Paper text:
The two molecules of the dimer, related by a non-crystallographic 2-fold axis, in the asymmetric unit of both the type II and III crystals of the GBSSrtC1 display the typical sortase fold made of an eight-stranded beta-barrel. The barrel core is flanked by two long N-terminal helices (H1 and H2), positioned approximately at 75° to each other and away from the dimer interface, which is formed by β6 strands and β4/β5 loops. Subtle differences, such as one single-turn α-helix in the β1/β2 loop present only in chain B of both dimers, and a four-turn and two-turn H1 helix in the type III and II structures, respectively, may explain the plasticity in the sortase structural features, the presence of multimers in the asymmetric unit and the observed multiple crystal-packing arrangements. Residues 44–55 and 44–54 in type II (A and B chains, respectively) and 44–51 and 46–53 in type III (chain A and B, respectively), which cover the putative active site from one-end to the other, form the lid region in GBSSrtC1. In addition, the preceding leucine residue (Leu47) was observed inserted into a highly hydrophobic pocket in the active site present below the lid. The residues in the hydrophobic pocket included Val118 (on the β4 strand), Ile162 (at the edge of the β6 strand) and Tyr171 (on the β6/β7 loop).
The membrane-associated sortase recognizes the LPXTG motif of the substrate protein, cleaves between the Thr and Gly, and forms an acyl-enzyme intermediate. According to the current model of sortase-mediated pilus assembly, the pilus polymerization catalyzed by a pilus-specific sortase is followed by cell wall anchoring of pilus polymers by the housekeeping sortase.
Residue numbers in the entry: 2 to 39, 44 to 51, 60 to 206
Write the structure that this text describes.
């Protein structure tokens, strides 16, 4: 739950520097591929192996949003039962390891009584930060843009060359769900410790 986020942190440091690196390289190449593409077409999210190099205890990292006090693991795919445990990554977009010309897209449900999750995302504001902890470390984002789009539209979801973004996508307005809320971070250097 919050308990399988620790399964992550701990299991990671049992993987040695070399192995970690090899996996990271695979993710980078995957991202380079997407960078250079010409367009995947992204099935709006409303097994999956594409991100195995990143998977540790069936998760690909976790995401921390301080403003809403969440720390939620991230699972590959927008799969139906995975969105009950945490955050799903939209296949077709960059893998959430950052780097020049990336754009990862993460997504989560709102208003599940037990989970919570992205329900409180509307409370997030340009200027807040959020952080992504994956096999090779923590990376940090600062919300530069906030947008509301019809589900048909996706142009905002694609890689912007030269730039490094992560989008936290959810449905909106609350309990109406006719459009999508996009909360966009822009990479900043990590300095929290």
């Amino acid at each position: 739950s919050h308990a399988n986020i620790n399964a992550f942190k701990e299991a990671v440091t049992k993987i040695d520097r070399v192995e970690i690196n090899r996996r990271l390289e695979l993710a980078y190449a995957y991202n380079a591929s997407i960078a250079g593409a010409k367009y995947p077409a992204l099935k709006d999210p409303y097994v999956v192996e594409y991100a195995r190099m990143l998977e540790v205890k069936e998760q690909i990292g976790h995401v921390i949003i301080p403003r809403i006090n969440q720390d939620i693991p991230i699972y590959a795919g927008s799969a139906e039962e995975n969105l009950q445990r945490g955050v799903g990554h939209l296949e077709g977009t960059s893998l959430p390891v950052g780097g020049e010309s990336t754009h990862a897209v993460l997504t989560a449900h709102r208003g599940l009584p037990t989970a919570k999750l992205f329900t409180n995302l509307d409370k997030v504001t340009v200027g807040d930060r959020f952080y992504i902890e994956h096999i090779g470390g923590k990376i940090a984002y600062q919300v530069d843009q906030i947008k509301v789009i019809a589900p048909d539209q996706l142009e905002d979801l694609y890689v912007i060359q030269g730039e490094d973004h992560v989008t936290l996508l959810t449905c909106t307005p609350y309990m109406i769900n006719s459009h999508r809320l996009l909360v966009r971070g822009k990479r900043i250097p990590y300095v929290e410790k």
